[PDB]
Amino acid sequence: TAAYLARRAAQKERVRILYRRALKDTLNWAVHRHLFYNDAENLRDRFEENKHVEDPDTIDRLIADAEASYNKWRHPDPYIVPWAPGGSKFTRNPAPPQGIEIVYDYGREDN
Amino acid sequence: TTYKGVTIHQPKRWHTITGKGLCAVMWFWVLYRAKQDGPVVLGWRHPWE
Amino acid sequence: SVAYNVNLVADQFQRAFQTSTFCNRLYSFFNKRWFFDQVLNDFLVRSF
Amino acid sequence: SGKHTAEFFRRRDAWRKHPMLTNQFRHATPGLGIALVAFGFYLVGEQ
Amino acid sequence: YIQTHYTAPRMVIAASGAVKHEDIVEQVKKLFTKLSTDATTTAQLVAKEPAIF
Amino acid sequence: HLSKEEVIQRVLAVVKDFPKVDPSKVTPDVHFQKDLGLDSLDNVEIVMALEEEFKLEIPDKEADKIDSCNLAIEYIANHPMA
Amino acid sequence: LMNHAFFKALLFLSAGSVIHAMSDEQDMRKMGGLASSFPFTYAMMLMG
Amino acid sequence: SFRSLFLTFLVPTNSFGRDILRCHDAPIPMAIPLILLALGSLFVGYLA
């Protein structure tokens, strides 16, 4: 009775990731803050409309269809925090890596 | 000043004075030039009139 | 005036971009450098 | 639900109503007042 | 074959007529134990080596 | 760097500013599903609000891993860009 | 060319001031409501 | 240009509260070039 629980948890994680990405791209599309609330409520209603589905197979197909729809309508240039991976400040002035040694007197005629 | 839990300091006096004065100079220059060369630009009369 | 109308009083552009394939494609086309960079880069540079 | 999400984000965004961030179009043209008063002085001084 | 194919996710008890759903569910919970639990699903079994006309 | 007490206070403010949440029963060591009764989507909404307040971006896996207040404070305090 | 050099350098310098003050934000979707907090910089941007 | 002006300065705030607290306008050596460029963008076109 553990494999079914694991597969359901994986499907729930996929749904949560999809909802997170959809909310972020909804904020990206509705640039203004006051326009974001109505779009967020509409998308939350869309997510909760298809809640409480029994068969895991049709749940998986719903997840796949939602992922495809999200990939179709995602923002071309979604907002990224400047220091986040893919931002404008990413790897701008990184801290020096640890465990790096500089060797003196490398090449000499005699040791 | 703070409103709920966030306080925002007033911009510096020299910042405000410089910005306001330079914009005022811009608008006054636009108005003076409009008065001087209004009819010429709008075709009301040639410069040699 | 058009900029003021679009930016400050408008509540339909996002819905159009999310439910209209042509509108989404037009938005992507104008956002992504007329697709000129992608097409030129991909074709010529990938071939080379 | 959707209304719960909207209420949540509206409550979280209550700091944006700061008196220095509510209305910004009053600062759109800072120099019009002084410029117009000075131009009125100039126009009066012409005559 | 039983252990590899008669797994609980692929198993449905259908009752029709003069039955009560709560009683049927209780009896199924009491009886249908120690059933095989295999991660392989019929969807992936179909996806592997599918049928071509 | 940002103090852990301030991190705790801001996270608690984010959690308390929720419709389906009773503000009285919010403690730095509560669980979203268990104590104050929220589902997964409310958890990810709270995580998004925490991101928006703290000016930080979390990968989706770690955002899913954040499921309770204690986890939220721990992650935000460990992050150096808080 | 000379006029564009002047006012375009002005625009770039003002945008750089805004970006530097905003912790290198650079994105307009997260830049609203800075007219009050940037009097001189907004004045320069408006002139340019 | 007017869309950029509105979004950066006049649209109600959309930035994060982290950046709003610590925002400071351009210091003296970032403002002296701006003032000269503003004077040029005012009078260079008319003089030349």
* DSSP one-letter string for G2-39: HHHHHHHHHHHHHHHHHHHHTTS---GGG--S-TTT-H
Name the DSSP class of F43: H
Mutate to test the interface with F, among H16, H20, H22, H23 (most CBs of F within 10 A): H16
Q: Is D1 in contact with A48 (Cβ distance < 8 A)? A: yes
CA C10 to chain centre: 18
Q: Would you say F54 and H18 are in contact if contact means Cβ atoms under 8 Å apart? A: yes
- With contacts defined as CB-CB under 8 Å, which chain A residues touch C7? 32
Per-position DSSP letters for chain C, written without gaps between them: -HHHHHHHS-SSHHHHHHH-HHHHHHHHHHHTGGGHHHHHIIIIIHH-
Residue A78: left if φ>0, alpha if ψ -120 to 50, beta else—which one? beta
Q: Is G43 in contact with B11 (Cβ distance < 8 A)? A: no
Q: CA-CA distance, D21 to A101, in Å (whole number)?
A: 51
The count of other CB atoms within 10 Å of the CB of residue D20 is 21
Which tokens hold the place of D20? 């220095």
Q: Does D42 touch chain B (CB under 8 A)?
A: yes
Q: For residue A58, what is the nearest residue in chain E, using CA coordinates?
A: E43
- With contacts defined as CB-CB under 8 Å, which chain H residues touch B29? 42-43
Q: Does D32 touch chain B (CB under 8 A)?
A: yes
Q: Catalytic positions of F, please?
A: 39
Token pair 């419709």: residue: F19
Interface A:F, ≥3 CB–CB pairs < 8 Å: yes
Strand-pair partners of F68: F31
Structure resolution, Å: 3.2
The count of other CB atoms within 10 Å of the CB of residue A39 is 20
CA proximity to A88, closest of G25, C32, C38, G18: G25
How many CB pairs lie under 8 A apart between chains A and C? 21
Q: Is A82 in contact with G29 (Cβ distance < 8 A)? A: no
Q: Is D21 in contact with H11 (Cβ distance < 8 A)? A: no
CA proximity to F70, closest of F37, F27, F14: F27
Task: Determine phi and psi for B2, rounding to 5 degrees.
Answer: -125, 145
Which tokens hold the place of A88? 């404008």
Q: For residue F39, what is the nearest residue in chain D, using CA coordinates?
A: D1
Which tokens hold the place of C47? 């071939």
CA F50 to chain centre: 6
Which tokens hold the place of A15? 């749904």
- For residue D31, count CB atoms less than 10 angstroms from its CB and return exposed for 0-12, middle for 13-18, buried for 19 or more: buried
- With contacts defined as CB-CB under 8 Å, which chain A residues touch C31? 76-77
Q: Would you say A30 and A43 are in contact if contact means Cβ atoms under 8 Å apart? A: no
Helix boundaries (H) for F1-82:
4-16, 40-54, 60-65, 69-78
Nearest CB to B24 within list D18, D31, D42:
D31
Q: Is A37 in contact with D1 (Cβ distance < 8 A)? A: no
Q: Is G35 in contact with D16 (Cβ distance < 8 A)? A: no
SS3 state at B7: strand
Q: CA-CA distance, F64 to A20, in Å (whole number)?
A: 9
Q: CA-CA distance, G20 to H29, in Å (whole number)?
A: 13
Q: CA-CA distance, G43 to B18, in Å (whole number)?
A: 9
Q: Would you say H37 and G10 are in contact if contact means Cβ atoms under 8 Å apart? A: yes
Q: Is G25 in contact with A31 (Cβ distance < 8 A)? A: no
Q: Would you say B16 and B23 are in contact if contact means Cβ atoms under 8 Å apart? A: no
SS3 state at H47: helix
How many CB pairs lie under 8 A apart between chains G and H? 106
Strand-pair partners of E36: E7
Q: CA-CA distance, F72 to G7, in Å (whole number)?
A: 47
Q: For residue E33, what is the nearest residue in chain A, using CA coordinates?
A: A1
Strand-pair partners of E7: E36
**Helix, strand, coil percentages, rounded to 5, for chain E:** 45, 5, 50
Q: CA-CA distance, H8 to G5, in Å (whole number)?
A: 22
The per-residue b/e assignment along F21-47, b for 16 or more CB within 10 angstroms, e otherwise, is: beeeebebebebeebbebebbbbbbbb
Which residue pairs, CB below 8 angstroms and at least 24 apart, start in B6-13?
Answer: B6/D15, B6/D18, B6/H17, B6/H20, B6/H21, B7/H21, B8/D18, B8/D20, B8/D21, B8/G37, B8/H20, B8/H21, B11/G36, B11/G37, B11/G38, B11/G39, B11/H25, B12/H25
CA proximity to A66, closest of A41, A94, A47, A79: A47
Q: Does A90 touch chain D (CB under 8 A)?
A: no
Question: Is residue E25 within a helix (H) or strand (E), and if so which, with residue range?
Answer: helix E21-31
Q: Is C4 in contact with H6 (Cβ distance < 8 A)? A: yes
Helical packing angle, H28-47 and G39-47, nearest 10°: 20
Strand-pair partners of B2: B7
Amino acid at A65: D
Way it was determined? cryo-EM
Nearest CB to D16 within list H9, H10, H13:
H13
Taking the CA of residue A92 and the nearest CA in chain G, the distance in Å comes to 11
Q: Would you say A70 and A18 are in contact if contact means Cβ atoms under 8 Å apart? A: yes
Q: Would you say G35 and D24 are in contact if contact means Cβ atoms under 8 Å apart? A: yes
Taking the CA of residue H1 and the nearest CA in chain D, the distance in Å comes to 14
Q: CA-CA distance, E47 to D42, in Å (whole number)?
A: 86
- Please report, to the nearest 10 degrees, the dihedral formed by the alpha carbons of residues F29, F34, F36, F42 taken in order: 100
Which residue pairs, CB below 8 angstroms and at least 24 apart, start in C1-8?
Answer: C3/H2, C3/H3, C3/H6, C4/H2, C4/H6, C6/H3, C7/A32, C7/H3, C7/H6, C7/H7, C7/H11, C8/H6, C8/H11
Q: CA-CA distance, A61 to A69, in Å (whole number)?
A: 12
Which tokens hold the place of F37? 């009764």
Helical packing angle, B13-42 and D32-46, nearest 10°: 50
Name the DSSP class of E17: S
Q: Does A16 touch chain G (CB under 8 A)?
A: no
Q: Would you say G36 and D24 are in contact if contact means Cβ atoms under 8 Å apart? A: yes
Q: Does D30 touch chain G (CB under 8 A)?
A: yes
Amino acid at B36: Q
CA proximity to G33, closest of F51, B6, B13, D16: D16
How open is the CA angle B16-H25-A92, to the nearest 5 degrees?
Answer: 170
**Chain H positions with Cβ closer than 8 Å to B:** 17, 20-21, 25, 31, 35, 38, 42-43, 46
Q: CA-CA distance, A69 to A67, in Å (whole number)?
A: 5
Q: Would you say G17 and H30 are in contact if contact means Cβ atoms under 8 Å apart? A: yes
Mutate to test the interface with H, among F10, F51, F55, F56 (most CBs of H within 10 A): F55
Q: CA-CA distance, A12 to A8, in Å (whole number)?
A: 6
Taking the CA of residue H24 and the nearest CA in chain D, the distance in Å comes to 15
Token pair 């220095």: residue: D20
Q: CA-CA distance, F27 to A71, in Å (whole number)?
A: 38
Tell me the CA distances in angstroms from E30 to A107, E17, E33, G4, one per residue in order.
Answer: 81, 21, 7, 84
Per-position DSSP letters for chain A, written without gaps between them: --HHHHHHHHHHHHHHHHHHHHHHHHHHHS-SHHHHHHHHHHHHHHHHHT-----HHHHHHHHHHHHHHHHHHS-SS----TTSTTSTTTTSSPPPPSS----SS-S-S--
Interface E:G, ≥3 CB–CB pairs < 8 Å: no
Taking the CA of residue B2 and the nearest CA in chain G, the distance in Å comes to 14
